[PDB]
Coordinates of all heavy atoms in Angstrom, one line a residue:
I261 N 70.1 -128.8 81.8 CA 68.8 -129.4 81.7 C 68.9 -130.6 82.6 O 69.8 -131.4 82.4 CB 68.5 -129.8 80.4 CG1 68.9 -128.7 79.4 CG2 67.0 -130.2 80.3 CD1 69.2 -129.2 78.0
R262 N 68.1 -130.8 83.6 CA 68.0 -132.1 84.4 C 66.6 -132.7 84.3 O 65.7 -132.2 83.8 CB 68.5 -131.8 85.8 CG 69.0 -133.0 86.5 CD 69.6 -132.6 87.9 NE 70.5 -131.6 87.7 CZ 71.5 -131.2 88.6 NH1 71.4 -131.7 89.7 NH2 72.4 -130.3 88.3
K263 N 66.6 -133.9 85.0 CA 65.3 -134.6 84.9 C 64.6 -134.6 86.2 O 65.1 -135.0 87.2 CB 65.6 -136.0 84.7 CG 64.5 -136.8 84.0 CD 65.0 -138.1 83.3 CE 64.9 -139.2 84.3 NZ 63.5 -139.8 84.4
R264 N 63.4 -134.1 86.2 CA 62.7 -133.9 87.5 C 62.7 -135.1 88.4 O 62.9 -135.0 89.5 CB 61.3 -133.3 87.5 CG 61.4 -131.8 87.1 CD 60.2 -131.1 87.3 NE 60.3 -129.8 86.9 CZ 59.4 -128.8 87.0 NH1 58.3 -129.0 87.7 NH2 59.5 -127.6 86.5
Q265 N 62.5 -136.2 87.8 CA 62.5 -137.3 88.7 C 63.9 -137.9 88.2 O 64.1 -138.0 87.2 CB 61.5 -138.4 88.3 CG 60.1 -137.8 88.3 CD 59.3 -138.0 87.1 OE1 59.9 -137.7 85.9 NE2 58.2 -138.6 87.1
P266 N 64.7 -137.9 89.2 CA 66.0 -138.3 88.8 C 66.3 -139.8 88.8 O 66.8 -140.2 88.0 CB 67.0 -137.6 89.6 CG 66.2 -136.6 90.4 CD 64.8 -137.3 90.5
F267 N 65.9 -140.4 89.9 CA 66.2 -141.7 90.2 C 65.7 -142.8 89.1 O 66.4 -143.6 88.8 CB 65.9 -142.1 91.5 CG 66.5 -141.3 92.6 CD1 65.7 -140.5 93.3 CD2 67.9 -141.3 92.7 CE1 66.3 -139.6 94.3 CE2 68.5 -140.6 93.7 CZ 67.7 -139.8 94.4
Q268 N 64.5 -142.5 88.5 CA 64.2 -143.4 87.4 C 65.1 -143.1 86.3 O 65.5 -142.0 86.1 CB 62.7 -143.0 87.0 CG 62.4 -143.4 85.5 CD 61.1 -142.7 85.2 OE1 60.4 -142.2 86.0 NE2 60.8 -142.9 83.9
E269 N 65.7 -144.2 85.7 CA 66.8 -144.0 84.8 C 66.5 -143.6 83.4 O 65.3 -143.5 83.0 CB 67.6 -145.2 84.7 CG 66.7 -146.4 84.2 CD 67.4 -147.8 84.5 OE1 68.6 -147.7 84.9 OE2 66.8 -148.8 84.3
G270 N 67.6 -143.2 82.7 CA 67.5 -142.8 81.4 C 67.2 -141.3 81.3 O 66.5 -140.8 82.1
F271 N 67.6 -140.7 80.2 CA 67.3 -139.3 80.0 C 67.6 -139.2 78.6 O 68.7 -139.0 78.2 CB 68.3 -138.5 80.8 CG 68.1 -137.0 80.5 CD1 66.8 -136.5 80.3 CD2 69.2 -136.1 80.5 CE1 66.6 -135.2 80.2 CE2 68.9 -134.7 80.3 CZ 67.6 -134.3 80.2
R272 N 66.6 -139.4 77.7 CA 66.7 -139.2 76.4 C 65.6 -138.3 75.9 O 64.5 -138.3 76.4 CB 66.6 -140.6 75.6 CG 65.3 -141.3 75.8 CD 65.3 -142.6 75.1 NE 66.3 -143.5 75.5 CZ 67.5 -143.7 74.9 NH1 67.7 -143.1 73.8 NH2 68.3 -144.7 75.3
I273 N 65.9 -137.3 75.0 CA 65.0 -136.4 74.5 C 65.1 -136.4 73.0 O 66.1 -136.3 72.4 CB 65.2 -135.0 75.0 CG1 64.6 -133.9 74.3 CG2 66.7 -134.7 75.0 CD1 64.7 -132.5 74.9
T274 N 63.9 -136.6 72.4 CA 63.7 -136.7 71.0 C 62.8 -135.5 70.4 O 62.2 -134.8 71.2 CB 63.1 -138.0 70.6 OG1 63.4 -139.0 71.6 CG2 63.8 -138.6 69.2
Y275 N 62.6 -135.6 69.1 CA 61.9 -134.5 68.5 C 60.4 -134.5 68.9 O 59.8 -133.5 69.2 CB 62.0 -134.6 66.9 CG 61.2 -133.5 66.2 CD1 61.7 -132.4 65.9 CD2 59.9 -133.8 65.9 CE1 61.0 -131.3 65.2 CE2 59.2 -132.8 65.2 CZ 59.8 -131.6 64.9 OH 59.0 -130.6 64.2
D276 N 59.9 -135.7 69.0 CA 58.4 -135.8 69.5 C 58.2 -135.4 70.8 O 57.1 -135.0 71.3 CB 58.0 -137.3 69.2 CG 58.3 -137.8 67.9 OD1 58.9 -137.1 67.1 OD2 58.0 -139.0 67.6
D277 N 59.3 -135.3 71.6 CA 59.1 -135.0 73.0 C 59.0 -133.5 73.2 O 58.4 -133.0 74.3 CB 60.4 -135.5 73.8 CG 60.9 -136.7 73.3 OD1 60.5 -137.2 72.2 OD2 61.9 -137.3 73.9
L278 N 59.3 -132.6 72.2 CA 59.2 -131.2 72.2 C 57.8 -130.8 71.6 O 57.8 -130.1 70.6 CB 60.3 -130.6 71.6 CG 61.7 -130.7 72.3 CD1 62.7 -129.7 71.7 CD2 61.5 -130.5 73.8
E279 N 56.8 -131.3 72.1 CA 55.4 -130.9 71.7 C 55.2 -129.4 71.9 O 55.5 -128.9 73.0 CB 54.4 -131.8 72.4 CG 54.4 -133.3 72.1 CD 54.1 -133.6 70.7 OE1 53.4 -132.7 70.0 OE2 54.4 -134.7 70.2
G280 N 54.7 -128.7 70.8 CA 54.3 -127.4 70.9 C 55.4 -126.4 71.0 O 55.2 -125.2 71.2
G281 N 56.7 -126.9 71.0 CA 57.9 -126.0 71.0 C 58.5 -125.5 69.8 O 59.6 -125.3 69.6
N282 N 57.6 -125.7 68.7 CA 58.1 -125.4 67.3 C 58.6 -124.0 67.2 O 57.9 -123.1 67.6 CB 57.0 -125.7 66.3 CG 56.6 -127.1 66.3 OD1 57.2 -127.9 65.6 ND2 55.5 -127.5 66.9
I283 N 59.8 -123.8 66.6 CA 60.4 -122.4 66.5 C 59.7 -121.7 65.5 O 59.5 -122.1 64.4 CB 61.9 -122.6 66.2 CG1 62.6 -123.5 67.3 CG2 62.5 -121.2 66.1 CD1 64.1 -123.6 67.1
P284 N 59.3 -120.4 65.8 CA 58.7 -119.6 64.8 C 59.7 -119.2 63.8 O 60.9 -119.1 64.0 CB 58.3 -118.4 65.7 CG 58.2 -118.7 67.1 CD 59.3 -119.7 67.1
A285 N 59.1 -119.0 62.5 CA 60.0 -118.6 61.4 C 60.4 -117.1 61.6 O 59.8 -116.4 62.3 CB 59.3 -118.8 60.1
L286 N 61.4 -116.7 60.8 CA 61.7 -115.3 60.8 C 61.1 -114.6 59.7 O 61.3 -115.0 58.5 CB 63.3 -115.3 60.7 CG 64.1 -115.6 61.9 CD1 65.5 -115.3 61.7 CD2 63.6 -114.8 63.1
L287 N 60.3 -113.5 59.9 CA 59.8 -112.8 58.9 C 60.8 -112.1 58.0 O 61.9 -111.7 58.4 CB 58.9 -111.7 59.6 CG 58.4 -110.5 58.6 CD1 57.0 -110.0 59.2 CD2 59.4 -109.2 58.8
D288 N 60.4 -111.8 56.8 CA 61.2 -111.1 55.9 C 61.2 -109.6 55.9 O 60.2 -108.9 55.3 CB 60.9 -111.5 54.4 CG 62.0 -111.1 53.4 OD1 62.6 -110.0 53.5 OD2 62.4 -112.0 52.7
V289 N 62.2 -109.1 56.7 CA 62.1 -107.6 56.9 C 62.2 -106.9 55.6 O 61.6 -106.0 55.4 CB 63.3 -107.2 57.8 CG1 64.4 -108.2 57.5 CG2 63.7 -105.8 57.7
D290 N 63.1 -107.4 54.7 CA 63.3 -106.6 53.6 C 62.0 -106.5 52.7 O 61.7 -105.5 52.2 CB 64.4 -107.2 52.7 CG 65.3 -106.1 52.0 OD1 64.7 -105.0 52.0 OD2 66.3 -106.4 51.5
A291 N 61.4 -107.7 52.7 CA 60.2 -107.7 51.9 C 59.1 -106.7 52.4 O 58.5 -105.9 51.7 CB 59.6 -109.0 51.9
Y292 N 59.1 -106.7 53.8 CA 57.9 -105.9 54.3 C 58.2 -104.4 54.1 O 57.5 -103.6 53.8 CB 57.9 -106.1 55.8 CG 57.0 -105.1 56.5 CD1 55.6 -105.2 56.6 CD2 57.6 -104.0 57.1 CE1 54.8 -104.4 57.3 CE2 56.8 -103.1 57.8 CZ 55.4 -103.3 57.9 OH 54.7 -102.4 58.6
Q293 N 59.6 -104.2 54.3 CA 60.0 -102.8 54.2 C 59.7 -102.4 52.8 O 59.2 -101.4 52.6 CB 61.4 -102.6 54.4 CG 61.8 -102.1 55.7 CD 61.7 -100.6 55.8 OE1 60.7 -100.0 55.4 NE2 62.8 -99.9 56.3
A294 N 60.1 -103.2 51.8 CA 60.1 -102.7 50.4 C 58.7 -102.4 50.1 O 58.4 -101.5 49.4 CB 60.6 -103.8 49.6
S295 N 57.8 -103.3 50.6 CA 56.5 -103.3 50.1 C 55.9 -102.0 50.5 O 55.4 -101.1 49.7 CB 55.7 -104.3 50.6 OG 56.2 -105.6 50.2
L296 N 56.2 -101.8 51.8 CA 55.5 -100.5 52.2 C 56.1 -99.3 51.8 O 55.4 -98.5 51.4 CB 55.7 -100.5 53.9 CG 55.0 -99.4 54.5 CD1 53.5 -99.5 54.3 CD2 55.4 -99.3 56.0
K297 N 57.4 -99.3 51.5 CA 58.0 -98.1 50.9 C 57.5 -97.8 49.5 O 57.6 -96.7 49.1 CB 59.5 -98.2 51.1 CG 60.2 -96.8 51.1 CD 61.5 -97.0 51.7 CE 62.2 -95.6 52.0 NZ 63.5 -95.8 52.6
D298 N 57.3 -98.9 48.7 CA 57.0 -98.5 47.3 C 55.4 -98.3 47.3 O 54.9 -97.8 46.2 CB 57.5 -99.4 46.2 CG 57.5 -100.9 46.6 OD1 56.3 -101.3 47.0 OD2 58.5 -101.5 46.6
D299 N 54.7 -98.7 48.3 CA 53.4 -98.5 48.4 C 53.3 -97.0 48.5 O 52.6 -96.2 48.0 CB 52.7 -99.1 49.5 CG 52.5 -100.7 49.2 OD1 52.4 -101.1 48.1 OD2 52.5 -101.5 50.2
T300 N 54.4 -96.6 49.3 CA 54.6 -95.2 49.6 C 54.8 -94.4 48.4 O 54.3 -93.4 48.1 CB 55.6 -95.0 50.6 OG1 55.4 -95.8 51.8 CG2 55.8 -93.5 51.0
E301 N 55.7 -95.0 47.5 CA 56.1 -94.4 46.3 C 54.8 -94.1 45.4 O 54.8 -93.1 44.8 CB 57.1 -95.1 45.4 CG 58.6 -95.1 46.0 CD 59.5 -95.9 45.1 OE1 59.3 -95.9 43.9 OE2 60.5 -96.4 45.7
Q302 N 54.0 -95.1 45.4 CA 52.8 -95.0 44.7 C 52.2 -93.5 45.2 O 51.4 -92.9 44.5 CB 51.7 -95.9 45.1 CG 51.9 -97.4 44.8 CD 51.0 -98.4 45.5 OE1 50.3 -97.9 46.5 NE2 51.0 -99.6 45.1
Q374 N 49.7 -99.2 52.3 CA 48.6 -100.1 52.0 C 49.1 -101.2 51.1 O 50.0 -100.9 50.3 CB 47.5 -99.4 51.3 CG 47.5 -97.9 51.5 CD 46.8 -97.1 50.4 OE1 46.1 -97.8 49.6 NE2 46.9 -95.8 50.4
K375 N 48.6 -102.4 51.2 CA 48.9 -103.5 50.4 C 50.4 -103.9 50.6 O 51.2 -103.9 49.8 CB 48.8 -103.2 48.8 CG 47.4 -103.0 48.4 CD 46.5 -104.1 48.6 CE 45.1 -103.8 48.2 NZ 44.2 -105.0 48.4
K376 N 50.6 -104.2 51.9 CA 52.0 -104.5 52.2 C 52.0 -106.1 52.6 O 51.2 -106.5 53.4 CB 52.4 -103.7 53.5 CG 51.3 -102.9 54.2 CD 50.5 -103.8 55.1 CE 49.6 -103.0 55.9 NZ 50.3 -102.2 56.9
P377 N 52.9 -106.8 51.8 CA 53.1 -108.2 52.1 C 53.9 -108.2 53.3 O 55.1 -108.6 53.2 CB 53.8 -108.7 50.9 CG 53.4 -107.7 49.9 CD 53.2 -106.3 50.5
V378 N 53.4 -107.9 54.4 CA 54.1 -107.9 55.6 C 54.4 -109.4 55.6 O 55.6 -109.9 55.7 CB 53.2 -108.0 56.7 CG1 53.9 -108.0 58.1 CG2 52.3 -106.8 56.7
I379 N 53.4 -110.2 55.4 CA 53.5 -111.5 55.5 C 54.5 -111.9 54.4 O 54.3 -111.5 53.3 CB 52.2 -112.2 55.4 CG1 51.2 -111.4 56.3 CG2 52.3 -113.6 55.8 CD1 49.8 -112.0 56.1
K380 N 55.5 -112.8 54.7 CA 56.4 -113.3 53.8 C 57.3 -113.9 54.7 O 58.4 -113.5 55.0 CB 57.2 -112.1 53.3 CG 57.9 -112.5 52.0 CD 56.9 -113.1 51.0 CE 57.6 -113.6 49.7 NZ 56.7 -114.2 48.8
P381 N 56.8 -115.0 55.2 CA 57.8 -115.6 56.1 C 59.0 -116.0 55.2 O 58.7 -116.5 54.1 CB 57.2 -116.9 56.6 CG 56.0 -117.2 55.7 CD 55.7 -115.9 55.1
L382 N 60.1 -115.8 55.5 CA 61.3 -116.1 54.6 C 61.6 -117.5 54.5 O 61.7 -118.1 55.6 CB 62.5 -115.3 55.1 CG 63.8 -115.3 54.1 CD1 63.3 -115.1 52.7 CD2 64.7 -114.2 54.6
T383 N 61.8 -118.0 53.3 CA 62.1 -119.4 53.1 C 63.5 -119.9 53.4 O 63.7 -120.9 53.9 CB 61.5 -119.8 51.8 OG1 60.2 -119.3 51.6 CG2 61.5 -121.4 51.7
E384 N 64.5 -119.2 52.7 CA 65.8 -119.7 52.6 C 66.8 -118.6 53.0 O 66.4 -117.5 53.0 CB 66.1 -120.2 51.3 CG 66.5 -119.2 50.2 CD 65.2 -118.4 49.7 OE1 64.1 -118.9 50.0 OE2 65.4 -117.4 49.1
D385 N 68.0 -118.9 53.4 CA 68.9 -117.9 53.7 C 69.7 -117.5 52.6 O 69.3 -117.9 51.4 CB 70.0 -118.3 54.8 CG 70.8 -119.5 54.4 OD1 71.0 -119.8 53.2 OD2 71.4 -120.2 55.2
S386 N 70.7 -116.6 52.7 CA 71.4 -116.1 51.6 C 71.8 -117.2 50.8 O 71.6 -117.1 49.6 CB 72.5 -115.3 52.0 OG 72.0 -114.0 52.5
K387 N 72.5 -118.2 51.4 CA 73.1 -119.1 50.5 C 72.1 -120.1 50.1 O 72.4 -121.3 50.0 CB 74.3 -119.8 51.2 CG 75.6 -119.2 50.8 CD 75.9 -117.9 51.7 CE 75.8 -118.3 53.2 NZ 76.9 -119.3 53.5
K388 N 70.9 -119.6 50.2 CA 69.7 -120.6 49.9 C 69.8 -121.8 50.6 O 69.8 -122.9 50.0 CB 69.8 -120.8 48.4 CG 69.7 -119.6 47.5 CD 70.2 -119.8 46.2 CE 70.6 -118.5 45.5 NZ 71.3 -118.9 44.2
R389 N 69.9 -121.8 51.9 CA 69.9 -123.0 52.6 C 68.4 -122.9 53.2 O 68.1 -121.8 53.8 CB 70.9 -122.9 53.7 CG 72.3 -123.0 53.2 CD 73.3 -123.0 54.4 NE 73.6 -121.8 55.0 CZ 74.8 -121.5 55.4 NH1 75.8 -122.3 55.3 NH2 75.0 -120.2 56.0
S390 N 67.7 -123.9 53.2 CA 66.3 -123.8 53.7 C 66.0 -123.7 55.2 O 67.0 -124.2 55.9 CB 65.5 -125.1 53.3 OG 64.3 -125.2 53.8
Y391 N 65.0 -123.1 55.6 CA 64.8 -123.0 57.0 C 63.9 -124.2 57.4 O 63.4 -124.3 58.6 CB 64.2 -121.7 57.4 CG 65.2 -120.5 57.5 CD1 65.3 -119.7 56.4 CD2 66.0 -120.4 58.5 CE1 66.2 -118.6 56.5 CE2 66.9 -119.4 58.5 CZ 66.9 -118.5 57.6 OH 67.8 -117.5 57.6
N392 N 63.5 -125.1 56.5 CA 62.7 -126.3 56.7 C 61.4 -125.9 57.5 O 61.1 -126.3 58.5 CB 63.5 -127.3 57.6 CG 64.9 -127.5 57.1 OD1 65.8 -126.7 57.3 ND2 65.1 -128.6 56.3
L393 N 60.6 -125.0 56.8 CA 59.3 -124.6 57.2 C 58.5 -125.9 57.2 O 58.5 -126.7 56.4 CB 58.8 -123.6 56.4 CG 59.3 -122.1 56.7 CD1 60.7 -122.0 55.9 CD2 58.4 -121.1 56.2
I394 N 57.4 -125.9 58.1 CA 56.5 -127.0 58.2 C 55.6 -127.0 56.9 O 55.2 -128.0 56.4 CB 55.6 -126.9 59.5 CG1 54.8 -125.6 59.5 CG2 56.6 -127.0 60.7 CD1 53.9 -125.5 60.8
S395 N 55.3 -125.7 56.4 CA 54.6 -125.6 55.2 C 54.8 -124.2 54.7 O 55.5 -123.4 55.2 CB 53.1 -125.9 55.3 OG 52.4 -124.8 56.0
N396 N 54.3 -124.0 53.4 CA 54.6 -122.7 52.8 C 53.7 -121.5 53.4 O 54.2 -120.4 53.4 CB 54.3 -122.8 51.3 CG 53.2 -123.7 50.9 OD1 52.7 -124.4 51.8 ND2 52.6 -123.5 49.8
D397 N 52.5 -121.9 53.9 CA 51.6 -120.9 54.4 C 51.6 -121.0 56.0 O 50.5 -120.6 56.4 CB 50.2 -121.1 53.8 CG 50.2 -120.9 52.3 OD1 50.8 -121.9 51.5 OD2 49.7 -119.9 51.8
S398 N 52.6 -121.3 56.5 CA 52.6 -121.4 58.1 C 53.7 -120.5 58.6 O 54.7 -120.1 57.9 CB 52.7 -122.8 58.5 OG 51.7 -123.6 58.2
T399 N 53.7 -120.2 59.9 CA 54.7 -119.3 60.6 C 55.5 -120.1 61.5 O 56.1 -119.6 62.4 CB 54.0 -118.2 61.2 OG1 53.0 -118.8 62.2 CG2 53.1 -117.4 60.3
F400 N 55.7 -121.4 61.2 CA 56.6 -122.2 62.1 C 57.4 -123.1 61.2 O 57.1 -123.5 60.1 CB 55.7 -123.1 62.9 CG 54.9 -122.4 64.0 CD1 53.8 -121.7 63.8 CD2 55.4 -122.4 65.3 CE1 53.1 -121.0 64.8 CE2 54.8 -121.7 66.4 CZ 53.6 -121.1 66.1
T401 N 58.6 -123.4 61.7 CA 59.6 -124.3 61.1 C 59.7 -125.6 61.8 O 59.2 -125.8 62.9 CB 61.0 -123.6 61.1 OG1 61.6 -123.8 62.4 CG2 60.9 -122.1 60.8
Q402 N 60.2 -126.5 61.2 CA 60.4 -127.9 61.7 C 61.4 -127.9 62.8 O 61.6 -128.9 63.6 CB 60.8 -128.9 60.6 CG 59.7 -129.0 59.5 CD 60.2 -129.9 58.4 OE1 61.2 -130.7 58.5 NE2 59.7 -129.6 57.3
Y403 N 62.2 -126.8 63.0 CA 63.1 -126.6 64.1 C 62.3 -126.5 65.4 O 61.2 -125.8 65.4 CB 63.9 -125.5 64.0 CG 65.0 -125.7 63.0 CD1 65.3 -124.7 62.0 CD2 65.8 -126.8 62.9 CE1 66.3 -124.9 61.1 CE2 66.7 -126.9 61.9 CZ 67.0 -126.0 61.0 OH 68.0 -126.2 60.1
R404 N 62.7 -127.2 66.5 CA 62.1 -127.1 67.7 C 63.1 -126.9 68.8 O 64.2 -127.6 68.9 CB 61.3 -128.3 68.1 CG 60.1 -128.6 67.2 CD 59.2 -129.7 67.7 NE 58.1 -129.9 66.9 CZ 57.3 -131.0 67.1 NH1 57.4 -131.8 68.1 NH2 56.2 -131.2 66.4
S405 N 62.8 -126.1 70.0 CA 63.7 -125.9 71.0 C 63.2 -126.3 72.4 O 62.1 -126.0 72.7 CB 64.0 -124.6 71.0 OG 64.1 -124.1 72.5
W406 N 64.1 -126.8 73.2 CA 63.7 -127.1 74.5 C 63.4 -125.9 75.3 O 62.6 -125.9 76.1 CB 64.9 -127.8 75.2 CG 64.5 -128.1 76.6 CD1 63.7 -129.0 77.0 CD2 65.1 -127.4 77.7 NE1 63.7 -128.9 78.4 CE2 64.7 -127.9 78.8 CE3 66.1 -126.4 77.8 CZ2 65.0 -127.6 80.1 CZ3 66.5 -126.1 79.0 CH2 65.9 -126.7 80.2
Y407 N 64.2 -124.9 75.0 CA 63.9 -123.6 75.9 C 62.6 -123.2 75.5 O 61.8 -122.9 76.4 CB 64.9 -122.6 75.5 CG 64.8 -121.5 76.5 CD1 64.7 -121.6 77.9 CD2 64.7 -120.1 76.0 CE1 64.5 -120.6 78.8 CE2 64.5 -119.1 76.9 CZ 64.4 -119.3 78.3 OH 64.3 -118.3 79.1
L408 N 62.3 -123.2 74.2 CA 61.1 -122.6 73.8 C 60.2 -123.3 74.5 O 59.4 -122.8 75.2 CB 61.0 -122.8 72.3 CG 61.8 -121.8 71.5 CD1 61.1 -121.6 70.2 CD2 61.8 -120.4 72.2
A409 N 60.2 -124.7 74.5 CA 59.1 -125.4 75.1 C 58.9 -125.2 76.6 O 57.9 -124.9 77.0 CB 59.2 -126.8 74.9
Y410 N 60.0 -125.2 77.3 CA 59.8 -125.1 78.8 C 59.2 -123.8 79.0 O 58.3 -123.6 79.8 CB 61.1 -125.1 79.5 CG 61.2 -125.5 80.8 CD1 61.4 -126.8 81.2 CD2 61.2 -124.5 81.8 CE1 61.5 -127.2 82.5 CE2 61.3 -125.0 83.1 CZ 61.6 -126.2 83.5 OH 61.7 -126.6 84.8
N411 N 59.6 -122.9 78.3 CA 58.9 -121.6 78.6 C 57.5 -121.4 78.1 O 56.7 -120.8 78.8 CB 59.8 -120.4 78.3 CG 60.6 -119.9 79.5 OD1 60.9 -120.6 80.3 ND2 60.9 -118.6 79.6
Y412 N 57.3 -121.8 76.9 CA 55.9 -121.4 76.3 C 55.1 -122.6 76.0 O 54.0 -122.5 75.7 CB 56.2 -120.7 75.1 CG 57.0 -119.4 75.4 CD1 58.3 -119.4 75.0 CD2 56.6 -118.4 76.0 CE1 59.2 -118.4 75.1 CE2 57.4 -117.3 76.2 CZ 58.8 -117.3 75.8 OH 59.6 -116.2 76.0
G413 N 55.7 -123.9 76.2 CA 54.9 -125.0 75.7 C 53.8 -125.2 76.7 O 53.4 -124.4 77.5
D414 N 53.3 -126.5 76.7 CA 52.2 -127.0 77.5 C 52.8 -127.1 79.0 O 53.8 -128.0 79.2 CB 51.6 -128.2 77.1 CG 50.3 -128.5 77.9 OD1 50.3 -128.4 79.1 OD2 49.3 -129.0 77.1
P415 N 52.3 -126.4 80.1 CA 52.8 -126.7 81.3 C 52.4 -128.0 81.9 O 53.0 -128.4 83.0 CB 52.2 -125.5 82.2 CG 51.0 -125.2 81.4 CD 51.3 -125.4 80.0
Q416 N 51.5 -128.7 81.3 CA 51.0 -130.0 81.9 C 51.4 -131.2 81.2 O 52.0 -132.1 81.9 CB 49.4 -130.0 81.8 CG 48.8 -128.9 82.7 CD 48.5 -129.4 84.2 OE1 49.0 -130.4 84.5 NE2 47.8 -128.6 85.0

């Protein structure tokens, strides 16, 4: 990663600098699958279920419970999808 204007000094990048580059959460595959399949055993699939914690119950630090984004942010993500302006 380099700085487009290079001669002006300094190159520091902080969390606030990655506007709009918030990393999407990972959906709960198991949950979706299960739901659909037992609906099958009986529609009404809680696809939605962004997963909150990992196996060892380590949090993914979601921005909120009813959102699809985590407090994690990435530079790559931003340069590619963030605001071009």
Side-chain angles (χ1 to χ4, degrees):
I261 314 151
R262 199 174 307 193
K263 209 162 90 76
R264 287 195 186 185
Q265 300 128 311
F267 303 110
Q268 157 188 347
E269 59 199 348
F271 178 34
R272 59 179 65 259
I273 164 173
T274 335
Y275 180 90
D276 311 1
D277 327 5
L278 293 192
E279 296 291 341
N282 295 279
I283 300 183
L286 286 184
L287 164 147
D288 198 312
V289 36
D290 215 346
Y292 169 85
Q293 255 278 51
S295 302
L296 186 57
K297 208 161 190 176
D298 42 54
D299 285 333
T300 306
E301 286 180 31
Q302 297 164 351
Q374 344 158 5
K375 298 300 180 177
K376 12 76 171 297
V378 183
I379 318 178
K380 195 58 184 177
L382 184 44
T383 316
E384 77 286 347
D385 66 24
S386 278
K387 265 80 61 61
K388 304 162 205 168
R389 295 185 277 216
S390 175
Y391 285 102
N392 313 79
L393 287 77
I394 62 178
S395 72
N396 41 340
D397 300 71
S398 301
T399 62
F400 289 79
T401 80
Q402 301 171 20
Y403 287 134
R404 293 187 180 179
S405 141
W406 175 70
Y407 187 46
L408 279 202
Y410 202 89
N411 267 28
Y412 308 102
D414 192 317
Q416 294 276 8

